[PDB]
Design a protein around this ligand. Structure first.
Ligand SMILES: [Mg+2]
Ligand SMILES: [Mg+2]
Ligand SMILES: [Mg+2]
Ligand SMILES: [Mg+2]
Ligand SMILES: [Mg+2]
Ligand SMILES: [Mg+2]
Lengths: 367, 367
DNA sequence: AAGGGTCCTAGGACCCT
DNA sequence: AAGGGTCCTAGGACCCT
């Protein structure tokens, strides 16, 4: 019943990918740029005051020597992301992706199999790889402690393999569920790992300062929670369930209140191949024409190449737009005539366009 | 590439189920009642003027000796329905259900395998079972005609097996796709079958008188179509594609216009086990209390028994209501604590109720 | 005051760089 | 003027008795 979960989180992912391909960006403060936004930066630039999602203005003031490369084309980040998930899938096949740079793996089976190869005495010699959260003391007679320490050893092998085979560093957290694995992986955050023993779980959740730091509690849920006076993890833990249901719904209230205790029974899901392919472009009110069709060709061309490479065939297309002041969209199936190309696809999309600062196209429903 | 599809349509299904269980209703005009509505009747009662979906008032005027049994509890109809689909699944495993009394089967593989067991001469002796639509002449040298005639023989075996093994009669239509199979199965409608040869396809679609007779064109789409002056199959066939897209959407316009030509490339889908379980009750404004919770207990009890029997476990529940003058609903996941009961389920539903002539409960998301 | 089914759509919540 | 992802929800279209 008890699970050993690992969460793997790569260091400054986009920046790290760039530093690998142009080694002259090591040691130099590096920011990866997307339009007006420095979406991430390496640790050189972080020391200098640069931070993630910071206007390229504010950033090059804090670090005028900041080197900036353009990371709008996600292609290379996307491709490394899958090399990581595939490498982890070798350890155990059930790997759950979260964004491009995070993976969950359920090591429970792996941990148990390794423990069965051990023998009475060497059980006394199981050691931890990496940090133990809250410098908590290990009890080798606690079977849960032994399993999490074995988890931590698998985690160090994963991280070692990632570096040996892909040149990537990252952090890992080992805990009894996904929430806790993900919260603990970030405790020692540059290329290190941390294991959470059960006795320190409450210390972990109460170390957070705003309830939005809980994965699953986001921008809107946080704002609602404040409006009820809920600001700390303990506030949410102790707040009326009944009121929380009425004011948020029985699904949301129940789960986030569970999360507030560090409880999370969600299984690690095999993400497998993606469920969708999309390309976006944004622009400061730079489209007011039905000659926004030029923008939709490039988005298609990239998607069309990405589809051909995946091999599967999509059966639904969607067009998303953002009107200047909250997005609108229209989708429809992809004629079977097509599924087996530029010209017909553009016609569908422009009809979809006409039925309606950003344009996006998405292929989903892949077979 | 060419398909041989069969569509199977049981005769006066509910009524037929009732006549089997109480044989004294044979020969007597029988109507199956649901609230104020005679939802179907046997052919005795049809001769006498009784028709489907007719108020029990109008019906017992046309046939005061009309016997009425109550068919609100679908349990027995549902159970026979699956005995039919399972019987057909023996012929070929890919059977698509449509409602409780219709099934599609792709006989293409079966037809081809039987033709390979034949030998030059006996090919000259392939005959049709049942009607040929439009009394069209068979050409034994036309491979498409030979395959559809073999289809018709499989169809007669299916219908014979249905009667021998379940006591049920019905109609079958054999054609090159689902649209045409379903349209042709009803041509000779009491316990008979009909095969559609390709040359008569246009005669079949133009035999219809209102475009709503096309499966896929329903109440709303028909009303829209009229408002554009489209009233006949030929009107829809010849009407501007462009206008039809703008006025209905690129998905709907394109498919229904294809249907108007008798074209339908949709595959026969293996329906397999149901995707949802639901129970409804209606009442003439007979609920104005939070003591509509009594109505939700019975709906649950029936669903709960149905779930236990299926074996799988649902992960979503929905509550549907109809406010007296167009339905509203609320769903939420089913706590994992529960998935492994009356009391907690009722509490969820009444919360769902309170966030909001008919009450319904649905379990979906089965695993 | 039928009693069920199917799948699609547009939007919104969450997650990451 | 980021550029992507995931899944859930409420409603609506269709089909049948
Ligand atoms: Mg990360
Ligand atoms: Mg990271
Ligand atoms: Mg959060
Ligand atoms: Mg029928
Ligand atoms: Mg019927
Ligand atoms: Mg119709």
């Amino acid at each position: 019943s008890s699970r050993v979960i690992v969460h793997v989180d790569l260091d400054c992912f986009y920046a790290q990918v760039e530093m690998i391909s142009n080694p002259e960006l090591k040691d130099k403060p590096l920011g990866v740029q997307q339009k007006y936004l420095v979406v991430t930066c390496n640790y050189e630039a972080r020391k200098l005051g640069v931070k993630k999602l910071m206007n390229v203005r504010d950033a090059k003031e804090k670090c005028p020597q900041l080197v900036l490369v353009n990371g709008e084309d996600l292609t290379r980040y996307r491709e490394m992301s899958y090399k990581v998930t595939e490498l982890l899938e070798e350890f155990s096949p059930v790997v759950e992706r979260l964004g491009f740079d995070e993976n969950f793996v359920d090591l429970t089976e792996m941990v148990e199999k390794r423990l069965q190869q051990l023998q009475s005495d060497e059980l006394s010699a199981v050691t931890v790889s990496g940090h133990v959260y809250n410098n908590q003391s290990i009890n080798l007679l606690d079977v849960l402690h032994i399993r999490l320490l074995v988890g931590s050893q698998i985690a160090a092998e994963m991280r070692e393999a990632m570096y040996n085979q892909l040149g990537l560093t990252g952090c890992a957290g080992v805990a009894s569920n996904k929430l806790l694995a993900k919260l603990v992986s970030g405790v020692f955050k540059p290329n290190q790992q941390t294991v959470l023993l059960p006795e320190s779980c409450q210390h972990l959740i109460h170390s957070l300062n705003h309830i939005k730091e809980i994965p699953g509690i986001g921008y809107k849920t946080a704002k609602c929670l404040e409006a009820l006076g809920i600001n700390s993890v303990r506030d949410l833990q102790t707040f009326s369930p009944k009121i929380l249901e009425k004011e948020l719904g029985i699904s949301v209230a129940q789960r986030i209140q569970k999360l507030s205790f560090g409880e999370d029974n969600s299984p690690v899901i095999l993400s497998g191949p993606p469920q969708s392919f999309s390309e976006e472009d944004s622009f400061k009110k730079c489209s007011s024409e039905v000659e926004a069709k030029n923008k939709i060709e490039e988005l298609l061309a990239s998607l069309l190449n990405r589809v051909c490479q995946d091999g599967r065939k999509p059966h639904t297309v969607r067009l998303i737009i953002r009107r200047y002041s909250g997005r609108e969209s229209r989708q429809c199936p992809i004629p079977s005539h097509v599924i087996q190309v530029m010209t017909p696809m553009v016609d569908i999309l422009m009809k979809l366009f006409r039925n309606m600062t950003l344009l996006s196209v998405c292929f989903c429903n892949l077979k």
